[PDB]
Design a protein around this ligand. Structure first.
Ligand SMILES: N[C@@H](Cc1c[nH]c2ccc(Br)cc12)C(=O)O
Ligand SMILES: N[C@@H](Cc1c[nH]c2ccc(Br)cc12)C(=O)O
Ligand SMILES: [Fe+2]
Ligand SMILES: [Fe+2]
Ligand SMILES: [Fe+2]
Ligand SMILES: [Fe+2]
Ligand code: NI
Lengths: 229, 232
């Protein structure tokens, strides 16, 4: 029911768009430096997402038409972790700390959902046939696009004011993810119900992650980005 | 015959695993223990993931076999703090940029170390509690071998500096000796469960073998970065 599945992704996307967090990130009455205090939280996700694309999504030896399309997709997505580290530096969040402080931060109970999003997608897709992996990926990329559409607003305000090139919370990342977020497909009967479960899970896990970002902003509300012009 | 054969394949695997070159180096009392513990920070890529594997993947907060796993997982989910304890004592809790910390953990040279717990979680997500216990037994058997070896340079530094190490330490090995086969031994299983437990034991030992391979490669790459413990 590829029309239904996509219709569900569209419906889920329309709910995801309205989470409080994105209301806050899109609010031009608040300094862009404060709207980006969630940024160091993505550390629990960005490099795990690199690994999901490199080691879980990708099966380089496949003749499957859907798998080949996934493979090209994974090539692009697996480079964005360096963009994350680029803007971590620009935003003043790449602070000197003890090795153990870094580990305790990434493995915080407060970042459980952020850290385990890629893990859950790994467990969810490890036995799926290529066409079903594409539903997983399309759901996940739709949620990614919503988040980066939001983050790119305070990101580009800082970039222009400081005259620096941002790569991660920036229109150029939204541009690549736009192409990523085919339709000539008819799913077996129980596949359609499988795909509905995929879409519900990816969006539920994505919601839980934004949940933690909101909580972290609350709890670390003075810890605003410190970019330099 | 089934479970008799399975616990026997684990002993075969343990005796094979014990002979890897990394363990010859770690046990070698002619090398300074500070040099043998060059590989210690590599465990950063595994130790907090293993905590999460115990808290979230193995553990399930009425089947009698899950109930025993949960008391098992409860205890293992505490050893990550011991890791951070010894990280400091060895002089490996150094000040660095947050990004240097992230690039360390996600290094391509710590891939197998980093994905061991990932692989175990994926293998065991859809197993009956009996087969989870197989996974846990194989994995704990690999652990005891590693910590028997590391506790040697470990206890040498602890005595020479007079400090309580908790991770590369007999006190860790002793708790882990406790870790049960005695309920596993009093279990029967199918031609299916037979073939599956065989698949499990092989993968847990191959993945642990790959992790040890990366430790050996690290030591050779970073031969100058030996531990710098402080005496009391
Ligand atoms: N465009 C993202 C990938 C992404 C895809 N889906 C996501 C969901 C939540 C978060 Br945070 C990130 C993503 C990246 O480049 O790391
Ligand atoms: N006793 C270990 C658990 C462990 C169990 N199996 C392991 C295999 C490789 C390594 Br490194 C560690 C383990 C711990 O406390 O982290
Ligand atoms: Fe991206
Ligand atoms: Fe993408
Ligand atoms: Fe342990
Ligand atoms: Fe244990
Ligand atoms: Ni499965």
């Amino acid at each position: 029911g590829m029309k239904a599945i996509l219709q569900l992704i569209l419906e889920k996307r329309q709910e995801f768009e309205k989470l409080p967090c994105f209301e806050f990130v899109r609010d031009e009455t608040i300094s862009p430096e404060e709207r980006l205090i969630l940024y160091p939280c993505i550390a629990a996700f960005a490099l795990n997402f690199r690994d999901l694309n490199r080691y879980d999504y990708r099966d380089d030896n496949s003749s499957d038409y859907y798998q080949k399309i996934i493979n090209i997709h994974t090539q692009e997505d697996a480079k964005h972790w360096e963009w994350f580290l680029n803007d971590l530096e620009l935003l003043g969040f790449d602070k000197t700390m003890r090795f153990s402080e870094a580990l305790r931060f990434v493995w915080s109970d407060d970042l459980l959902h952020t850290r385990r999003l890629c893990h859950n997608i790994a467990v969810l897709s490890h036995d799926l046939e290529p066409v079903m992996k594409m539903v997983v990926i399309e759901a996940m990329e739709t949620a990614g696009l919503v988040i980066f559409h939001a983050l790119a607003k305070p990101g580009e305000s800082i970039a222009k004011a400081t005259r620096r090139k941002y790569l991660y919370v920036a229109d150029s990342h939204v541009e690549v993810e736009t192409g990523h977020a085919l339709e000539q497909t008819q799913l077996s009967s129980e596949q359609e119900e499988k795909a509905k479960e995929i879409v519900n899970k990816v969006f539920q896990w994505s919601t839980n992650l934004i949940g933690e970002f909101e909580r972290y902003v609350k709890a670390h509300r003075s810890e605003k980005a410190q970019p330099t012009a």
